[PDB]
């Protein structure tokens, strides 16, 4: 149901700590927002701390319902006042905050789905689950947010991390299932279209030899497949969970094919460069 929990261990942020907020209301002193990473606690983006230049209306830069990256400038745990500034947030800090929030939200979604599977009904159960799994990694790596996501990524390919936890059998099984379902990297297909033709005496033999020479430049974990589209146009297709080295390997496979075919007095051309096909 309405189960919610803080993304991190500490209940309140600190000064000079970029956080993600959601604008909820407009007031006189500033914009009343909710801190997304801290179970939607109230905060205020000050009107003075909104822009370096003079600003006439708060609605010029603030829209209700839009997420923002703001730096905390004042915390009062007693009164419950958190003051946020948008002027002091650098674009690089905004990108870092966005990435951290994305990772933390992924971890929170995984844990919330686990709790829903376990039919958890109270926020205390979710807090305990966060205590057992996520915050243990967070304070083991001394990196809030990043540590839990990195440890979860270390799973799937290595479930040996998820045995020191004090989870139950059902908890461990559901956590493993959810992490593998929502965190396993997918496979992207890289495709290129080339032209190979030999007008010499060798003919089809030269083209076949060059195609096989470029075909043997395939890593065991990454297959390379070459098929005829319609002569002299052929297609090279590969499927790899990770893309950059696949593009590179198709690139110098094309290079070696071109070298071999031009060695045998052939003609080579590239119709379409390697590209990730959906």
């Amino acid at each position: 149901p309405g189960l919610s929990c803080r993304f991190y261990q500490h209940k309140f942020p600190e000064v000079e700590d970029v956080v993600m907020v959601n604008v909820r209301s407009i007031a006189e002193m500033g914009a009343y927002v909710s801190l997304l990473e801290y179970n939607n606690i109230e905060g205020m983006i000050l009107l003075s701390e909104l822009s370096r230049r003079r600003i006439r209306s708060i609605n010029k830069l603030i829209r209700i319902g839009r997420n923002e990256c703001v730096v905390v400038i004042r915390v009062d745990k007693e009164k419950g006042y958190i003051d946020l500034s948008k002027r002091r947030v650098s674009p690089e800090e905004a990108i870092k905050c966005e990435d951290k929030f994305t990772k933390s939200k992924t971890v929170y979604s995984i844990l919330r789905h686990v709790a829903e599977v376990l039919e958890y009904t109270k926020d205390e159960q979710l807090e305990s689950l966060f205590q057992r799994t996520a915050w243990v990694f967070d304070d083991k790596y001394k990196r809030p947010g990043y540590g839990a996501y990195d440890a979860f990524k270390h799973a799937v390919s290595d479930p040996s991390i998820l045995d020191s936890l004090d989870l139950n059998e059902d908890e461990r099984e559901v956590l493993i299932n959810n992490i593998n379902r929502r965190l396993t990297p997918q496979a992207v297909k890289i495709r290129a279209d080339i032209e190979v033709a030999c007008y010499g005496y060798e003919g089809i033999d030269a083209v076949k030899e060059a195609l096989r020479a470029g075909l043997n430049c395939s890593t065991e974990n990454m297959p390379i497949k070459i098929n005829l589209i319609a002569p002299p146009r052929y297609v090279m297709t590969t499927t790899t969970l990770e893309r950059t080295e696949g593009l590179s390997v198709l690139s110098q496979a094309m290079a070696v094919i071109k070298e071999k075919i031009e060695e045998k007095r052939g003609v080579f051309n590239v119709q379409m460069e390697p590209k990730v096909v959906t």
Binding site: S51, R52, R53, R56, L61, R63, P91
Partner: protein, 346 residues
């Protein structure tokens, strides 16, 4: 990488401006121009603010000459130029700004200005990019800000007349219709009968709407309480470059003393006065007015199809923008705090 992509994107933008433009709105035009100028600032190599301003002006001249009737591109170029000037003056030790930039009696009496953009500051680029990002953020909400003032200008059972299809006016009316009941009369704005679409959308929102040709504007104006229109450009004296037939509507409203409200955002304000330049109207092919199937009759008949109409400021009652309501007599001030006089002619 940098140049090979930036020049290609500039060429694509210029070519799109020259031939067509697609379904792109004014907000999209401004956003794309701002992105282009931001990438020009980031990628191109400029030592001081003077070189950057010269390069921006050089690109803006081409972008404007691509399609003179699209004034949003020039408005955004001049806004970026003013932003560069403001940032440089802030880093050059001039304390308050946006007042000494404009010629003023008080400034003239108590001194003056001696501009010099030769100095180099390493933090200029970051400040300029931050200002451009703020401008884009403001663009993302200008339409909502305009629409939020709907209930302050419409009363119960009011008859509102509009011409053409304006997305800003459509959002304004739809926001007003949530809490109020009123009757809208839309002129079709021939030959491009966009008003028809404007009447369909307003009909989908439950607003009692009526369609009529541009010939019935004066006949129906006697029973119209308010006129709400969009615009393509707001000139430096408060005049309008609106769709064709808007001058007739404004005259009809002035005859009956019906208020005329222009719902236009801030980026549509252009510092160009309507002196002349012979580049005001945009004459599309006469196929829209007289079909090609007319025959030999077309070899001795001069057919003209202007798209835009010039509305003098005397016929305009109020301007509703993202910053609120203003009279046409205050537009000059909105010029001075948005554009620099030295940047009027790119």
């Amino acid at each position: 990488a940098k140049g090979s992509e930036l020049s290609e994107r500039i060429e694509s933008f210029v070519e799109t401006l020259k031939r067509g433009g697609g379904p792109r709105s004014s907000e999209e035009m401004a956003r794309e121009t701002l992105g282009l100028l931001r990438q020009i600032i980031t990628d191109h190599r400029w030592s001081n603010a003077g070189e950057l301003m010269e390069l921006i002006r050089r690109e803006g001249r081409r972008m404007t000459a691509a399609q003179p009737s699209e004034t949003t591109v020039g408005n955004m170029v001049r806004r970026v130029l003013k932003i560069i000037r403001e940032e440089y003056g802030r880093l050059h030790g001039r304390s308050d700004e946006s007042d000494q930039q404009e010629s003023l009696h008080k400034l003239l009496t108590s001194g003056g200005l001696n501009e010099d953009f030769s100095f180099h500051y390493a933090q200029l680029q970051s400040n300029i990019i931050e200002a451009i990002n703020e401008l884009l953020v403001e663009l993302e909400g200008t339409m909502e800000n305009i629409a939020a003032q709907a209930l302050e200008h419409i009363h119960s059972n009011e008859v509102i007349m509009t011409i053409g299809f304006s997305r800003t006016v459509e959002a304004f009316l739809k926001e007003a219709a949530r809490k109020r009941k009123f009757h809208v009369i839309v002129a079709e704005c021939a030959p491009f009968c966009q008003g028809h679409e404007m009447a369909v959308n307003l009909s989908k929102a439950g607003i009692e709407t009526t369609v009529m040709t541009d010939a019935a504007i004066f006949a129906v104006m006697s029973r119209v309480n308010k006129v709400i229109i969009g615009t393509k450009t707001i000139l430096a004296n408060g005049a309008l470059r609106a769709v064709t037939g808007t001058h007739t509507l404004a005259l009809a409203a002035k005859h009956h003393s019906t208020p005329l409200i222009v719902c236009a955002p801030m980026f549509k304000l252009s510092p160009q006065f309507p002196n002349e330049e012979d580049s005001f109207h945009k004459f599309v092919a006469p196929e829209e007015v007289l079909p090609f199937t007319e025959g030999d009759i077309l070899e001795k008949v001069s057919v003209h199809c202007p798209v835009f109409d010039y509305v003098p400021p005397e016929l305009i009652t109020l301007f509703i923008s993202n910053i609120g309501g203003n009279a046409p007599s205050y537009i000059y001030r909105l010029m001075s705090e948005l554009y620099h006089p030295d940047d009027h002619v790119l």
